[model samples]
Target: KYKLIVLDLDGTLTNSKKEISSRNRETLIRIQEQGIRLVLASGRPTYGIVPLANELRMNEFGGFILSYNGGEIINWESKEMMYENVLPNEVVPVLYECARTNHLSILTYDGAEIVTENSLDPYVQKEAFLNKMAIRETNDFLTDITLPVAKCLIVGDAGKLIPVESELCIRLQGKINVFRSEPYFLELVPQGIDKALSLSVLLENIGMTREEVIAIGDGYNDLSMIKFAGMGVAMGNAQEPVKKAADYITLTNDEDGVAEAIERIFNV
Candidate 1:
């Protein structure tokens, strides 16, 4: 049996309403009882993932959360820091400058809140809504920041963000890892850190290997882990590139994709 079962929360596990159905939750709880490790991997911040992690009782079972797209890992039960990586302090300034130049809104977490110079940006508001976190507007986000940032999100029009993503990939090349978590949500993490890389780190820490893992997802951000897992599963509603990369395709989130994948894999 796979030792670690990795999942992407938003488009892969939760339905359009962003809630886990009772059936899916029960299936996951039962799966955890069998001693397999569960992982919630997402572009969300640690604060954003905590509620769901707690609801799943991840900490009680030694499960883990790969938050900030794998820049950080926290043990489910202990809430202890298993491993962590943060954006270099030097790049934070330049990143904000670039976002401003590109006519985009950027935000970073400070304590329990998402802080932004432009709190009213609908994209920023969308993030706050999804994460169930508060957004704070600051006069100068640069000086107002708390340091050792894990990641930064650049938000804007979906059509506008695509080309900017390409440009940042080139311009910021080697300094940070850049990608689109959503069409409107451009993510920048510490150089060389991604969901798959972080999972590898977690596996090494636990004395496991890629072959003992099964990963599931439905977004561009989830593609890396899907490709790296022993069994990569894409939801029926997954983006096209994700479907092409997956080893198997399951039902959509609204259709109980997580439960379907679990039953197919472990006969639960």
Candidate 2:
């Protein structure tokens, strides 16, 4: 019997429209009522995941919001920060320089707005739209970003970002984590931060174990948790690598894959 369901947003839980379907929402509510906790794990910032967590009544049911690809974890009911790992401030300038040299747009979250040097970049705009946050163009990204940030996203054409990703991985090495959540979105987070690591921490704090969790996702960033969970699930629309790592493949997000997985796994 599973005690928890760990989900990824965007490509896994939300449809292309970025809305959770009634079937999926209702199924989750039902399961939560039955004592199965939930965790909305996403590369999105905390503010970006809040509305959906509220929609799912996570506050009432007592779950968690694992945001920034495990950079931060928040307990819904108590509104406590369960864990937080921020990027080193010194690395921000390095990332900014790399994006500038590669002709990519780099951005980080600041409260309700996305702080970027180029707010007009289509990819940056898309991110703002997806998060339903305003775009705040910064004249000087380095100086403006004084507070710590969980992650930095470098956005550009998928092909262009490929080399950047490789170069940064080698360049940064053990200083930080570098990966592409989407082909065009290269993510930079605190060193060693990943969904699986944070989930492990959450499970330990809550007195649960990995075997009692079901993790599902479709992105490369989701790979760690999906592989770590006892029943790792990949959406039917998941990237090939993610599917290869999953123990089972369910329908796509549009087809209510999350609901299907829950019903089939628990006989709901």
Candidate 3:
């Protein structure tokens, strides 16, 4: 029997509207009541993921929130930070320069708000909207963000950001972990941080093994955990590469894919 079900929020648990469907919500609540642990693994920040975790009653059922694409892990029940990693201070200025050079918007989470030079940038606005956080525009981004940050996002047009991704990968190799969570969103986190790595940390703490886990997602960033879990599930709407790497393909998120997977796999 699977002991844990790891879910990716945006394209797996939530529908296109970025809201959890009633069917998925009911199914998840039922599963949690049965003693199976749930992990909401996303590239979102802790503040961004909190409300969704609350809606699912994770605080009562017991689960974990893997945010910043594994930069931080928070135990839901006790609200303890089990693990955390952050970008190096020196790299911040480099990243800021890179964003400026590439004509992109760079932003990072500051508690409940997103801090950036251009909060009005469409891509930045979309991120703020998705996370349900307010944007804190700053004239001096470098000076404004003084505390340690889990990760930084550089946003711009998808196609335009492709070469920038490759360039940064080469330039910042081994210094910072960089990837595209969404086409327009280039993510930079502490080196070696990824969902699978963080899930491994959580599983160890809970005394669980990889074979007892089931991971599901629908994005490029989801690939790590999806492939690492015993049952790697890809949503039907998932990208082609993700589908190829998954052990099983379920219905689309809008079609209650998460509910379908849980029901079919556990017979609950």
Candidate 4:
């Protein structure tokens, strides 16, 4: 039996409509009843993951959540920050300049909400939908980013975003970590920060080892955690590279993939 099972939200546990199916919810409840801890890891912020965590009653079951691709980790019951990483003040301006020069739609955080000059951009609106966070438009991004951010998301069409992501990876490689969470969503986080690194810390705090854990996800951002788990699972809907990285592949999210993983791993 696994000690912990960390899952990604979008395209992994949730369907295209972004809702957890009744089957998945029921199966997860049973998995918790089996005494396995559940952790939700995502590109979303703390507030964005809260509602789903609540729906799963993770707090009641002593679960945890990893947000901003491991920038923040929270203890479900106490609602406390177990670990967190933030963008450097100086890098924020540089990221903004990159976005401007590349014609990419950019967004950063202000508390639980998103701050972006291009609030009306369709891609920016999509982010608001995903995070369920309020959007605050500003005439000036530099002024709006008064605080360090967990991560900066650069959103746009994947076709146009590919080269931009490539450029950023090379330009900011040593200073920051940059990759795509989704084909259309480019992410920039603090250097050397990844789900696996943060999960290692979380496990140490709980006195468990990676050998007792399972990591599940479907996106490019999910590679680190997937590779780190004792049994890294990729969803059937996962992209090619992610699928190739997994030790096991489960059903699609719409088909109750999480439920299948639990049934396979725990035989419950």
- What is the C-alpha RMSD, rounded to one decimal, of candidate 4? 1.6
lDDT of 3 by residue, 169-263 (tens): 89886899988878799999999999999999999988999999999999888888999999999999999999999999999999999999999
Cα lDDT, all candidates: 0.89, 0.92, 0.91, 0.87
Q: What is the C-alpha lDDT profile of model 1 across 129-172, one tens digit per residue?
A: 99988998998988988998898899998888887788778877
State candidate 2's TM-score: 0.96
The lDDT of model 3 is 0.91
Q: Write the per-residue lDDT of candidate 2 for residues 1-268, one digit (tens) a residue.
A: 7899999998899998999999999999999988889999998989899999999999998989999989899999899999999999988888999899998999999889899999889999989888999999998998887579999999999999998898888888689999887778899999988999999999999999899999999987788899999999999999899999999999999999999999998855
Q: How many residue pairs of model 1 clash at the backbone?
A: 2
Task: Give the poorly placed runs of model 3, Cα more than 4 Å off.
Answer: none
**All candidates in order of TM-score, best leading:** 3, 2, 1, 4
* TM-scores, all models, native as reference: 0.95, 0.96, 0.96, 0.94
Superposed model 4: Cα runs more than 4 Å off? none
TM-score of 3: 0.96
Choose the strongest candidate by TM-score: 3
